[PDB]
């Protein structure tokens, strides 16, 4: 099975996917984020952050309050299982993490922590 | 009948209303916009813009492309029936327009033209 996925965040504030499935046979999983828009990071910056469904709100609130210089993520936030950098137009970034950090039966959410974006930019991630 | 309405745009990128009814007995209509959030205009700026449902997309595209210095509205856009200024946290602005600019049967939309916000920040306005 494949253990990577390519995701896009555009100017309309949206991911080209709302659900991800991580095959249990994967040892590591990679996410390739790319920004096909024309707006700069400071106004339409997108990052891909993964946490349990329960931790999402907390991560989003503290992240938005941390500012652009911190890529909108409270430093040393242990709730973030994995995440890419905040990218602007024409930029791209990848993250690879150990699938052992995921458990079956648990509910995970991926989302962008740029002020207000998680309202639309979010989706589910499951270990099947 | 009342001829004004108070609207709020917060940090969660949302209006506290999605439908406005302008009573035909009104000669003028006023909209009081206020920003109860803490985020600045440059990151979570909100404006209240009115156009026909059909002109909305056009207005939004040309507006987002106009930048913060223009309050995200293409200069001299004749599609904009009325609008307030773009406001940041703790700011407010009112707009009053002639109800004679509205006709019955026509579908109107109000929305924010800050990059990507119209996806969630929009609503209907009707002359009944
Ligand atoms: C992209 C990065 C950046 O700093 N910037 C300018 O932002 C200016 N302002 C402003 O006027 C109020 C808050 C703020 O960041 C970009 O366009
Ligand atoms: Cu985003
Ligand atoms: Cu807005
Ligand atoms: Ni495989
Ligand atoms: Ni009246």
From Swiss-Prot, chains A, B:
The molecular function terms of the Gene Ontology recorded here are: copper ion binding; electron transfer activity; identical protein binding; transition metal ion binding; zinc ion binding
Source lineage? Bacteria, Pseudomonadati, Pseudomonadota, Gammaproteobacteria, Pseudomonadales
**UniProt-recorded name of the protein:** Azurin
- Residues annotated as binding Cu cation: 46, 112, 117, 121
Q: Which gene encodes it?
A: azu
The protein's predominant localisation is periplasm
Q: List the disulfide bonds.
A: 3-26
- Record-linked PANTHER family: AURACYANIN-B (PTHR38439), OUTER MEMBRANE PROTEIN H.8 (PTHR38439:SF2)
Summarizing the function annotation, the protein's role is: Transfers electrons from cytochrome c551 to cytochrome oxidase.
Location comes to: Periplasm
Q: Where is the Plastocyanin-like domain?
A: 1-128
One cellular component term (GO) for this entry is: periplasmic space
Presence of the UniProt keyword Nucleotidyltransferase in the record: no
UniProtKB keywords: Copper, Disulfide bond, Electron transport, Metal-binding, Periplasm, Signal, Transport
Q: Kindly give the Pfam families that the UniProt entry links to this protein.
A: Copper-bind
């Amino acid at each position: 099975a494949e253990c990577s996925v390519d995701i896009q965040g555009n100017d309309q504030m949206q991911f080209n996917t709302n659900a991800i499935t991580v095959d249990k046979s994967c040892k590591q999983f990679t996410v390739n984020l790319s920004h096909p828009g024309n707006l700069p990071k400071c106004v339409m910056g997108h990052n891909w952050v993964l946490s349990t469904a329960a931790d999402m709100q907390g991560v989003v609130t503290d992240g938005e309050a941390s500012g652009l210089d911190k890529d909108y993520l409270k430093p040393d936030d242990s709730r973030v299982i994995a995440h890419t950098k905040l990218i602007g137009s024409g930029e791209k970034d990848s993250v690879t993490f150990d699938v052992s950090k995921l458990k079956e039966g648990e509910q995970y959410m991926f989302f962008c922590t740029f002020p207000g974006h998680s309202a639309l930019m979010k989706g589910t991630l499951t270990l099947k």
